[PDB]
Amino acid sequence: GDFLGQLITVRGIITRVSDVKPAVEVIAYTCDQCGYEVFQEVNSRTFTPLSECTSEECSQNQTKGQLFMSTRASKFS
Amino acid sequence: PLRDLDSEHVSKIVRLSGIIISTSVLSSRATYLSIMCRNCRHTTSITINNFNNTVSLPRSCLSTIESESSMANEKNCGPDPYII
Amino acid sequence: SFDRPEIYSAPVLQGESPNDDDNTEIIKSFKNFILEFRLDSQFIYRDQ
């Protein structure tokens, strides 16, 4: 446990291979009122959806928007 | 004139003119400041604009409200921990 | 151990904007004042 962060070379036997499924990295969010796109980067295991808007133009105003995510604009892996 | 200032003139743009008696000795308010949680070691910063009672220091160490796993996994700064 | 997540955005679609004369609307009006007032042979507050 002192070789952390190094670049290594190991060998062995591939055992219990899982299946390939997409990993979500960043999520797009359509404003529908201010017309911006909010982006949230997740590096944790789980996460949460976020609040109604975080624009600069929906900000400093009485009526903020209410958002929802989108699929085709997100980046997967 | 200063004689007639009704309650209908509350919080409205009213001008006047008179005679100034005497000033005071100058004190100081604060606008920008960096704080520290005396247990959690948690630092933020606070700006204010309309300083004219209005705001004070909060009463939670605020490191608990965090969108990161490993920091929220690692207690009580409580009570009001903030020292300027 | 990771670092903090971040939030950023940018407005792209100029939609859902009635002239309701409000929070963001009033702010843009005074940019039309200071740079874009000019009295007779002189503009003053921009030169102030």
Added chain:
Amino acid sequence: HPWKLSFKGSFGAHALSPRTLTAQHLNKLVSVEGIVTKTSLVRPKLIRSVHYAAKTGRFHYRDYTDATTTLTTRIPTPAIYPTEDTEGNKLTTEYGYSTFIDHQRITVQEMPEMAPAGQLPRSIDVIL
């Protein structure tokens, strides 16, 4: 660098069975023998975090301790894992130069040859 020791040596004082060890001779040094069973997994432990700030271009320094190593009851001072330290530069994390030390905990059953005929065995734990 710790430069630890052994304390090798035979003594008839506290070479007792772990079966009869509990509630007596606490906070003392005891020599126990027995059976190694159900060995857990080897994990490393985080000690010293390293952080790079982008704009100032310097590193920093931060340690973390636990009550296991020190052997004396010291005032616990937990510290949250740092983010956004002084002005608002992002504390970009690094690795490699951050130091780490391995860790393990195991359980020890007593000797079956020393055990009585049939009763329920009882055990304790040892962290390495």
